[PDB]
Amino acid sequence: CWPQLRLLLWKNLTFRRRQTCQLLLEVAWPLFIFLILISVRLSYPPYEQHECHFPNKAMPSAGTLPWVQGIICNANNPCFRYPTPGEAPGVVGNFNKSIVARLFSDARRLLLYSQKDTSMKDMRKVLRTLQQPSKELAEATKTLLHSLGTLAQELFSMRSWSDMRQEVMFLTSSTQIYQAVSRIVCGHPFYDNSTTPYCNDLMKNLESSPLSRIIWKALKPLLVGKILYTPDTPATRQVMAEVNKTFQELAVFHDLEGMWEELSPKIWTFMENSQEMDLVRMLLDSRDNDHFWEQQLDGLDWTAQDIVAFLAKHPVYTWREAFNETNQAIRTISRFMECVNLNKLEPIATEVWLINKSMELLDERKFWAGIVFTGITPGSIELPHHVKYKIRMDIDNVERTNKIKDGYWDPGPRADPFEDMRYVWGGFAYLQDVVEQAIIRVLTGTEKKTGVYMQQMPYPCYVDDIFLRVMSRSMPLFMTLAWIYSVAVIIKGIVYEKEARLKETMRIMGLDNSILWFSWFISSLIPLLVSAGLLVVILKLGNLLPYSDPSVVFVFLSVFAVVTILQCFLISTLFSRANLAAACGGIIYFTLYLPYVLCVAWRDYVGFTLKIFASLLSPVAFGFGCEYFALFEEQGIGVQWDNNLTTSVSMMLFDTFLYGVMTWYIEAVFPGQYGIPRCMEEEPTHLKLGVSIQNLVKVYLALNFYEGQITSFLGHNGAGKTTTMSILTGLFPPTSGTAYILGKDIRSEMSTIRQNLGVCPQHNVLFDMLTVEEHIWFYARLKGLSEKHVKAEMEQMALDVGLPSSKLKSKTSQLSGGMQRKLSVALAFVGGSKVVILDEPTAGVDPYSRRGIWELLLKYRQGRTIILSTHHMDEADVLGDRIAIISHGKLCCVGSSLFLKNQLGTGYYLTLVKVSAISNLIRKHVSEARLVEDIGHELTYVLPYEGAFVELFHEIDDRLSDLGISSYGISETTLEEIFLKVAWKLTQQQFVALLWKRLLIARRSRKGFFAQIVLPAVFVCIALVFSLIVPPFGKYPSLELQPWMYNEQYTFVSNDAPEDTGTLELLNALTKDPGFGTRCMEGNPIPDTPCQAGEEEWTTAPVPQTIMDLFQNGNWTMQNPSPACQCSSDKIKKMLPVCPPGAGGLPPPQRKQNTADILQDLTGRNISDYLVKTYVQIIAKSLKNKIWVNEFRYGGFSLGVSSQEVNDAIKQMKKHLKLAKDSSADRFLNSLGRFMTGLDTKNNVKVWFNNKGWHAISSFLNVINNAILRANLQKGENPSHYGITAFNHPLNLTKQQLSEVALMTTSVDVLVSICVIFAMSFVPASFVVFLIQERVSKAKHLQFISGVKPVIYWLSNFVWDMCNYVVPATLVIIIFICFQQKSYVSSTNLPVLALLLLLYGWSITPLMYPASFVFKIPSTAYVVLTSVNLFIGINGSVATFVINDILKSVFLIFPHFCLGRGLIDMVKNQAMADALERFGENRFVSPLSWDLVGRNLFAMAVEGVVFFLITVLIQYRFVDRICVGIPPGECFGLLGVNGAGKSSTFKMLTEVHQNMGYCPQFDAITELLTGREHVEFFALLRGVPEKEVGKVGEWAIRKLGLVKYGEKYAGNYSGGNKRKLSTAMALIGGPPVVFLDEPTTGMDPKARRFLWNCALSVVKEGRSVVLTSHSMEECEALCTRMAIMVNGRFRCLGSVQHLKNRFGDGYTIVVRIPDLKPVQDFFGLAFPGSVLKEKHRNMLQYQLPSSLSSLARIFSILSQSKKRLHIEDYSVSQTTLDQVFVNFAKDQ
Ligand SMILES: *[C@@H]1O[C@H](CO)[C@@H](O[C@@H]2O[C@H](CO)[C@@H](O[C@@H]3O[C@H](CO[C@@H]4O[C@H](CO)[C@@H](O)[C@H](O)[C@@H]4O)[C@@H](O)[C@H](O[C@@H]4O[C@H](CO)[C@@H](O)[C@H](O)[C@@H]4O)[C@@H]3O)[C@H](O)[C@H]2NC(C)=O)[C@H](O)[C@H]1NC(C)=O
Ligand SMILES: *[C@@H]1O[C@H](CO)[C@@H](O[C@@H]2O[C@H](CO)[C@@H](O)[C@H](O)[C@H]2NC(C)=O)[C@H](O)[C@H]1NC(C)=O
Ligand SMILES: CC(C)CCC[C@@H](C)[C@H]1CC[C@H]2[C@@H]3CC=C4C[C@@H](O)CC[C@]4(C)[C@H]3CC[C@]12C
Ligand SMILES: *[C@@H]1O[C@H](CO)[C@@H](O)[C@H](O)[C@H]1NC(C)=O
Ligand SMILES: *[C@@H]1O[C@H](CO)[C@@H](O)[C@H](O)[C@H]1NC(C)=O
């Protein structure tokens, strides 16, 4: 058992080693694939990003100055990496150090001090009293001194103007300006025709200044934009007037220039020539006032000396420089604010005019967003209590509304300042908040009393390694390609071993399929394990899968190799061709891998039971395991032994078991064309009996085979000798019979029988890539011989074979057919087998190797029980010692050759070579004589039988010169007799005939290649159906801003400073009956979301034993309230950090708010740390369960706490000091007072928003605005039906975006075009494979032999190919015109596409014609042509992606590229015309224009023409004195030596064409055509009449027989029937000379005689024939004038008898008498040339050379010694023709 496994493994290893061409590619392909993989890996490094927070943005309602400050500097998401103070629950600042805020606060302080100041009036009163020592003078002076000291302190304590002037002077190197502006504004981390060109050049410089050009993108729609709204309802007018007030709040700088121009001369003369200033300067310099100023300064800067130097200066810094600087600053700020359009309000009547005006303003490049209301009628009614409004803005400034989420999840806070922040810099949130605040103010009356801020939630220290994810979630493809190559190789090997019938012989040799499958398994698993180990090595070292144990991945790859090995064992039993299976395995495994990518996209609704029932394949389970590996690898923890993956391994093992069972079943139920689906002479007792059959029978005989005799076994192959020989072997069991083979019953023991019983079937067994010595060694080891015994047997076999040389012993299977057959028949004798069963030896080999094999067989006659079974007569005659014939399953005759020939055989055959005279002489010499047959220069007679022989031969030899007889001959009866006795318009005719034949061969192929019609149909159907799934990619529907667009989310509300001031009522109205927003309130005014009504429970989730450790780890202050968390340590790359328990610290109270979501109170908790830890831990827990984790929370609120005095003070100040009512003084003061009172906020809210949700910030802003509105509502009936809804609907796209979408749709266009190109390329594949089938010596050369004019052949082929491509063209046209694809079904795009497909077919059908020329194998050009067509399609797709002019000019040669570009340009022009019609114009550029489409049509047409021409061109490519005369009726058989070039001479020697007929050596018939139609087509091509064609066909079908099977498929016939059809084809036209070649190959008796009779008859009609073969019996029975060709020249010619007598050997005699030596002694003494050819018991044979002319005396001596030697039987024969042939071949 095990030794056989060892031999099988050795054979497999030798097959692997000797190739030296497959294993190197096998080891290089995975290396190359994964080298490309690692090269791609080393190009994308892992991106690490620290955790950070984002500053809070301020809306316009929270103050104009903080809003502008938030716009200006902190507009980039700086990613602080540390919690900003803005995220603190109490403070909302971060502008502590803002010098502008300090300047404004100092200005407010100066104002409020001046209005409460009395120094001016006190100084005036003191001056009046002094002008009108004293008593009250001292008190007045003291009060004035104190007042002026306080004023000096106040004026010096501002400290803001100093920094402002220093910074503006330093500004008037790249980073210094940025640092200065950042320190100034906040803390520390064609247009020239419209307006004046000054600020045009300013904005040009802003766009060209080398800084972050993002602040300009945010400031452009703010100071240049322009808004417009719905019809002029008075309430809409009121809300727009409120918005206008909010806008003009910042217009204080507009009327400041007039104020300065009006106040400058007054303050100038006040500081120049006023008595008050002179008195102040006088009092500032004294002897006692200096100490007063020193005491009042409190040691501050700007002492009294500096004050006196600055103020008192009539002619180094006085007030004049400050005055000039302030004047210049005012000039600059006025010139800046001049072109700032603060009147951006335009009322519009209708919505269509709204859209038109917005588009016009967009063309004018000055257009901000636009509000659209929903008023019911232009009435004075205030509001319908529920405002629905939309904000229409440009697309490039608003986030798209077609999607609300990125889809696939990926780490990253999504905080890019420009790419995904359009709701901030675009101005959407600003206008939204302004409109909501205006609506709130107009509904109730409260002005602002509310601030709003936006805070982005932080992110917990993530890293970006998307490449690792996409490569570990798509591992199977590149993990499987190399094994696809490996499985193709192993399938090629398996099917090659199975096709050659080697497995059948292995089974016959005494083996079971189990050990073969095991050996194949081991031999294919060893290199797969090697490759798996190497891949584990290259993956671990590649740094692409760190922290992954090599052992577990190695075991995984080993199980994968095992399951793929069993899968290929499954797939191999369905194919019976090596290359076909090797090419189809790859595509079949690709098809089996596709379900994985098909199921991975629909993972949202896939069931575990569906996963199991779909895991019946190997690639899907491997992909699941790889997904497990990826999920456990991405987080850095790796994969280890931790007890999914186990389920995947179990499913893979179940798949292995299922594949094994499927193999075990299919190998038995459906095998190949060779498997089995589930007058008796004296018996010589001188030798031992080896095989004794006894009463053998089957389902609808007894012989005794002996040891030393080579017994023959003849039969009709239908009545026996086929199932009897199989029953003698182990193929089929017996049926009520027994046969003791060498003393062992067949049914008793079959193992010991096969141990000493060789076999040699017709199909030789010789493995390729091996030596004959290794063959003998392997067969001897399989026999069971020892080492020394095997060596001795190999030496003996090499000595007896005849090739004892290293040039042949160490060479591969390269010898000629002769030595190959000799070695194959000698192999059956290795091991010393005592019983051998041959089958058809020397079937089609030359007579020389036949004699050699005969000698080799006779050398093994010393007791081996050779059982011959052949259809040849001479072989079984000269080899068979006991001929036995059976018929009707019963034994008929048995005995020696002489016994069978003299018991029932006819008399002698006497021939004469060159008629009534000789006939009468023979009749007078012998009465029972007759004239058998007379041929050209020959005559035969029969002597049916004895002294008449002597007298007749004497009379013949005496009167020989009388007649024309030149030589005589005598022969015995051959065994074949005993076997038979016992059991012009011709061009149009050829055109229509070819068309008819091809039409029939296409019609009768319904079961055949009919898929070439429905397969392109189903593929184009799949394509056009998939084309109806991709969205139009250019739509933006009306989206409603509501936070519940996401299914589930966690909200939260944090109430800071709970003192009931202004926050408690707001937070209450946020969580009352109306809920969060507009979800459900007296109905559900939101579609597809009715709110869950019943839930009210303020509870805390059950906490595990972590509160314990939280208690024992006390002192958890506000700072560090929870244990820390580590992330991204060195050499440990973690996608998301892992934190210990107690991440948040305490589960907050959870409660549902009846809106399909749950809120948790976060009062007094650190919001940032809690959010970070909860988010990271929840995301980890969610991704742990393989759910494709989505987002968790989106938004929350933090409500906290941060006037008329300044307004009243400004009013009182304006009342005095030269009050007036001009448009320069009152306007500026009122605007400044409004700006001052529009900056204070009592209470505020901070909306925490996640940016992963595209529509989260706006929805939560709407929610908080609705909450504010419902809270500010007073004494209402109920807050239910009071609410606002915000919509987002962009405007229509313009020409630019239309061009962009027409450019980006080309991807889907080429995607749908590629599959059509692939599906349309399957029609010419059938044509080319049919041409290949007809090209290999079948019909092309045969039709070329007759007059066919080969150009007409290709012409008719092209015609039918066009006519047959017409059908699927119209079919697919109808199929995908049924679909409403306006790009194709239009009245202007249908004919162009129609003739585009037509010309594509016309150009593609001749392109694959020359590919059939050099291709000597059928049924495999299909796959390679499909592959190269796919490659051309990929090339055309790449060229379309894109020097382009020459590219599109030279790439028009490929018709696939032509059709692709045609479809692309067609859909492009369709989309362009549709867009132009949408915009309101009309373009009618026809697709048939020469430049666009039509150049491709002409190119494809001329390409088809030139391809047909070059195909015609390729076909045309632009012996020693052979002399013989063939008269009428001369069968001039021209034999030759081995390799004499008979086929070449036949092809050279072949009006003359029409006068010659050919019969191919190989069968030539269409497998799907009919029998009668073959000869009908060949008669049509011969030149017979159209009406007599049926008569000629009937004559041809009746002449050669087979009339019972005349109407059937030629492919379903047999060898004899195929040869009959072939020889009938050569007579359908009736030429004078018919050239035949091997008419009988593998045929049977009672059928060869039929063809021989037909040949003799067609010769007898005066028509000479010419044939050649190897069987010399056929030549001697058919030919009449031989022509032997030794080396190029005719070495011998003449009749058969003349050649047999001239150069032939002597006669041969056989005598029959235990025995006596005296008879042999007398026989040897009688003849001098007697030679003992064979000596047996009671039977002798001898040869007489050079003594044939004395046959009369030979017969006389025989008749004399008949009574003396007591001989029982005599026989005398002449030398056969095969002896003459082997003699001529020996002396060469
Ligand atoms: C909620 O919970 C978070 C943490 O989960 C708390 O945030 C912590 O508190 C501060 C932010 O509010 C952070 O303090 C900063 O730490 C920086 C780190 O630099 C080193 O810090 C270590 C101590 O950990 C020192 O030994 C080193 O010498 C380094 O200084 C400081 O650099 C930073 O100092 C600032 O520097 C800037 C620029 O120079 C100055 O302008 C500024 O005035 C200040 O000096 C500052 O001290 C703290 O790191 C942060 N994280 C942790 C783990 O503590 C929140 O505070 C909690 N919420 C509330 C309301 O408390
Ligand atoms: C809306 O506000 C703008 C300014 O914010 C007002 O326009 C002012 O008045 C006229 C034009 O109407 C101009 O001469 C002024 O220069 C504009 N600006 C200022 C600062 O006065 C406009 O009148 C307002 N419209 C409504 C309906 O209130
Ligand atoms: C035209 C004048 C009278 C009205 C404007 C007030 C300006 C000019 C006065 C009022 C207060 C003064 C400032 C108060 C003190 C300082 C701090 C010192 O380190 C630089 C000078 C500086 C900054 C003074 C410059 C001049 C000053 C800014
Ligand atoms: C900065 O913050 C502190 C809080 O410690 C506050 O007292 C101060 O007024 C702030 N500065 C401002 C608002 O300019
Ligand atoms: C804008 O697009 C809508 C969508 O159908 C269309 O009805 C409307 O007429 C378009 N308006 C303009 C001005 O193109």
Side-chain angles (χ1 to χ4, degrees), residues 244 248 251 254 342-343 1227:
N244 202 25
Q248 77 175 11
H254 175 86
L342 292 190
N343 198 16
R1227 289 207 306 173

Side-chain angles (χ1 to χ4, degrees), residues 1288-1345:
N1288 192 15
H1289 185 276
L1291 298 162
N1292 284 340
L1293 294 81
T1294 185
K1295 321 298 294 183
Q1296 279 70 238
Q1297 280 91 26
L1298 287 175
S1299 315
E1300 308 320 323
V1301 307
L1303 169 143
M1304 55 72 77
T1305 185
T1306 73
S1307 45
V1308 176
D1309 307 328
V1310 76
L1311 197 168
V1312 66
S1313 159
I1314 284 299
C1315 169
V1316 173
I1317 291 176
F1318 166 64
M1320 270 294 107
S1321 177
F1322 270 131
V1323 177
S1326 48
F1327 305 151
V1328 59
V1329 69
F1330 174 82
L1331 264 294
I1332 289 185
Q1333 266 190 351
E1334 265 202 355
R1335 196 208 67 92
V1336 290
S1337 280
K1338 301 309 174 184
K1340 211 172 81 73
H1341 175 56
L1342 185 52
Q1343 285 166 192
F1344 289 168
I1345 286 298

Side-chain angles (χ1 to χ4, degrees), residues 230 245 563 668 1146 1577 1618 1657 1661:
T230 53
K245 164 203 299 178
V563 60
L1146 279 174
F1577 165 85
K1618 287 176 182 182
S1657 53
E1661 306 305 317

Side-chain angles (χ1 to χ4, degrees), residues 1022-1150:
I1022 289 311
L1024 272 295
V1025 162
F1026 174 76
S1027 159
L1028 269 295
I1029 293 297
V1030 176
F1033 267 100
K1035 315 294 292 180
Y1036 302 102
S1038 158
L1039 192 140
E1040 199 258 324
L1041 296 172
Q1042 53 94 30
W1044 303 281
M1045 57 180 64
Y1046 319 124
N1047 293 84
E1048 204 60 43
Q1049 50 194 331
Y1050 280 43
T1051 74
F1052 68 96
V1053 172
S1054 165
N1055 172 34
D1056 192 286
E1059 308 302 318
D1060 303 65
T1061 78
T1063 53
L1064 173 144
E1065 70 267 16
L1066 191 52
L1067 69 95
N1068 273 17
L1070 195 142
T1071 174
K1072 294 295 183 180
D1073 191 327
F1076 281 165
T1078 183
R1079 206 193 153 110
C1080 50
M1081 50 193 191
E1082 291 198 339
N1084 318 107
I1086 313 188
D1088 193 9
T1089 177
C1091 81
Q1092 283 72 22
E1095 200 282 332
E1096 175 62 36
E1097 275 297 328
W1098 258 121
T1099 175
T1100 305
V1103 54
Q1105 298 308 104
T1106 174
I1107 47 171
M1108 294 285 106
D1109 63 62
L1110 184 67
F1111 183 76
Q1112 285 88 71
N1113 307 138
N1115 277 12
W1116 286 117
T1117 80
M1118 180 68 65
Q1119 296 88 322
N1120 185 37
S1122 167
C1125 195
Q1126 72 284 331
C1127 65
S1128 175
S1129 66
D1130 202 5
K1131 296 302 294 182
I1132 303 175
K1133 293 296 115 182
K1134 203 169 304 303
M1135 185 200 67
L1136 213 65
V1138 53
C1139 312
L1146 279 174
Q1150 181 77 272

